[PDB]
């Protein structure tokens, strides 16, 4: 479909086009500043993915349970009957909570891994 | 505690605040040059971590043994009775040796992995 072609498709359809858009995030003092800022934004998103334990991944699973209050919808009405723009709006008030939990979860897992590697 | 809040704490206490400071490494020609240089330094540190086999990790274990001459202290007097600034000063003369060994260790392991994947 091309860049943003899946924007109007359902979440479970648009989830198969992640590489199409990922490849378009990287591809006159004000223009140079714009390029530097675009690089900084890319690196900040990559840093967030790294902190959560998701390095070379576009889809990564975590150990943070869904708390229902964030969204109490069925899977059959999110992935099959909703777009990513609608979902993003629906949980825009909770994105700074979930991310914090994700960071804490990785911090515990990373330390646990170290302890499992210290058993002779 | 916040950014650098653990600077005066022991190594085994400050090791639990790595995400707090990692998130603060990314967050007018001279100012643009300063921003580009900050990005270059970030990428050089990430490249060193990648070469050593540590990608999306803040704590990673290696196969290089401690050679004692670098520091012959007990674990009980490093992690419990020392700060990271004191440790950094103590081994500042050896950081270019350890890193070299780390690169060599990964080079051997990476090749070994390839050979283990060529056995039918």
């Amino acid at each position: 479909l091309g860049f943003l072609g899946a924007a109007g498709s359902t979440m479970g359809a648009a989830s198969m086009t992640l590489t199409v858009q990922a490849r378009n995030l990287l591809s006159g003092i004000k223009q140079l500043q714009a390029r530097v800022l675009a690089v900084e934004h890319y690196l900040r998103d990559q840093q967030l993915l790294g902190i959560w334990g998701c390095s070379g991944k576009l889809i990564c699973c975590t150990n943070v349970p869904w708390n229902s209050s964030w969204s109490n919808r069925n899977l059959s009405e999110i992935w099959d009957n909703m777009t990513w723009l609608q979902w993003d709006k629906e949980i825009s008030n909770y994105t700074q909570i979930i991310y914090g939990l994700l960071e804490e979860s990785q911090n515990q897992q990373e330390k646990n891994e170290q302890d499992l590697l210290a058993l002779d | 505690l916040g950014f650098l809040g653990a600077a005066g704490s022991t190594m085994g206490a400050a090791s639990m605040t790595l995400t707090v400071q990692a998130r603060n490494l990314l967050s007018g020609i001279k100012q643009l040059q300063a921003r580009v240089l900050a990005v270059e330094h970030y990428l050089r540190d990430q490249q060193l971590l990648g070469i050593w086999g540590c990608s999306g990790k803040l704590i990673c274990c290696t196969n290089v043994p401690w050679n004692s001459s670098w520091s012959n202290r007990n674990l009980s007097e490093i992690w419990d009775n020392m700060t990271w600034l004191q440790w950094d000063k103590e081994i500042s003369n050896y950081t270019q040796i350890i890193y070299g060994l780390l690169e060599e260790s990964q080079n051997q392991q990476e090749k070994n992995e390839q050979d283990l994947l060529a056995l039918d």
Partner: antibody
Amino acid sequence: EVQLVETGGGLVQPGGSLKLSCRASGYTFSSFAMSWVRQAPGKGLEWVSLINDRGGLTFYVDSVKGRFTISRDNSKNTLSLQMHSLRDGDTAVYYCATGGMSSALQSSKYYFDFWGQGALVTV
Amino acid sequence: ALTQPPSVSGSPGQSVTISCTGTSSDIGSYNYVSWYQQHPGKAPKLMIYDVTQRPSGVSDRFSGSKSGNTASLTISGLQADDEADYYCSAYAGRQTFYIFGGGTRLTVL
């Protein structure tokens, strides 16, 4: 100065359950790994379970792996062990012990250090 | 399980040894062979940790060593008050953590 005092129930019927606990004092609870060891009335000592200092990692002997749960609360300085099914072969004096594991940044243990008074569980 | 003699004895002032044997995958593979003294009616207390190390507060009459796939505890200067069942234990691995032997009854003449 280290005091480990076991509490919990005594005799239960086969198929029941018991929650045992251990109160610790005299040392920093959160700084040491903890474990449970049992001794049948006519036998020697047998290791049953091990929990690390942060409570995140638990290990069991295969004979209890699917039946016993070990947990700790570092703010209450309290351990607990919840046993399900309760088989005839589980009759023993259970002891609370400090040691058996370390956390990579501490020196190695691989031994049990402090032992509690012990409590007898029968089926 | 580890194998120990069921009984050891000697006269006061003499030394005695208590053996502990296993296999090459457990007692022979890791140098973590501890010993405990369990007085009748009491909980076991730590006497030896590591292969050769003693806890602080324990008398220097208790020592030990290992060779091959075996280990032993040596009690020098045996006293009339050393009435206890002695146990050996060792770290086995990341699947099976600790293995204990049977108790050895120490009789002091």
